[PDB]
């Protein structure tokens with residue numbers, strides 16, 4: 164089973180986005196695959212470092228999404244993060260404008276709520 | 288990877304405990320291994336009706352504990368459950384009495400905080 168973590172870092176009502184180095188290379192949430200021997204947290208911290216060069220700490224686990232029909236089975240965990248050698252592609256997008264970046268027709272309010280939505284789950 | 292789900296169904300400040308058909312028996316939380324192809328949810332619902340015969344729905348993810356160093360790697364998810372629509376060994380124990388059944392004060396506080404502690408996480412590695 165594969166596991167992926169993504170971080171949501173909010174400051175002044177904006178979310179941190181990075182340019183994806185794969186696919187259509189759109190601005191998306193920072194994250195990556197959890198590597199063998201890594202706790203979800205170590206992976207999150209490593210991914211933030213490699214894609215934004217920032218040092219962070221887990222604030223809370225917000226939303227977990229699992230799709231076992233994937234190949235291989237996939238578990239997706241999203242963390243609320245707080246801030247504490249290539250130049251990184253980074254952008255702070257106002258939460259309002261997130262819809263202009265193609266963000267899900269099912270959420271955006273999920274992150275608007277912040278801690279209020281901690282622990283959300285889906286299963287599909 | 289081995290994934291385990293645990294259910295915490297609270298009603299009137301009491302937690303649902305089940306009696307283990309293994310080891311020294313003893314009252315513990317309902318849960319089990321997530322079987323291949325199941326979503327965490329499908330497994331939670333399945334374990335819940337095999338051990339308590341109740342129909343439940345997930346409220347929120349309460350706690351995620353992962354031990355990548357375990358053999359095999361372990362991910363343990365705890366769900367706050369809510370009731371919806373063979374005889375099982377079931378008991379509703381008041382939360383302020385869980386210490387009697389071996390639960391630590393730390394855990395009792397977690398369950399006690401309820402929805403307020405939703406989304407808790409902890410990574411555990413040896414050394």
Ligand SMILES: [Cl-]
Nearest residue numbers: 197198199200
């Ligand atoms: Cl690897």
